[PDB]
């Protein structure tokens, strides 16, 4: 593990943890899932948590949050993720599209930050993320 990627995990944890109390609840999961176009049920949210709830307190702490990520790490889902960003359906995530999603997740980003992000996932250098580039990132 590197410092930078600890920080990124930490930023992500914070996207979910809207009230900043250090724990992620089903409500906070639901809220993020819905901001990404999904419509989870109470039961689905509880299942997700239950899967990695090592201490049985019903909420997600930082290591459990990493454990969620580790599990998923162990395609059709990637096409769907992709569509969340590629809102005009044109096959390319632009910087503005990336920004729109980040804003709907409540994240405040400088123009430069958004471009940095596109630039990291961009592989061919055309300045956008296409589908195969989104796959590599999810992979």
């Amino acid at each position: 593990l590197t410092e930078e990627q600890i920080a990124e995990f930490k930023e992500a944890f914070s996207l979910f943890d809207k009230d900043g109390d250090g724990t992620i609840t089903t409500k906070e999961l639901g809220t993020v899932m819905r901001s990404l176009g999904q419509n989870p049920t109470e039961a689905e949210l509880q299942d997700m948590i239950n899967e990695v709830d090592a201490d049985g307190n019903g909420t997600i702490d930082f290591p459990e949050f990493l454990t969620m990520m580790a599990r998923k790490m162990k395609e059709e889902e990637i096409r769907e993720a992709f569509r969340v960003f590629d809102k005009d359906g044109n096959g390319y995530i632009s910087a503005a599209e990336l920004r729109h999603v980040m804003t709907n997740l409540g994240e405040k980003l400088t123009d430069e930050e958004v471009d940095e992000m596109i630039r990291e996932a961009d592989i061919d250098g055309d300045g956008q993320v296409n589908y195969e580039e989104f796959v590599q990132m999810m992979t």
């Binding site: 930023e11 996207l15 940095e116």
Partner: peptide
Amino acid sequence: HMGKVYAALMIFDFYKQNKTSRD
């Protein structure tokens, strides 16, 4: 920097793994 999106999407996808279809 794009790391945080990657992680949100992992949780996003973990949710998908845990779906139950229609009543």
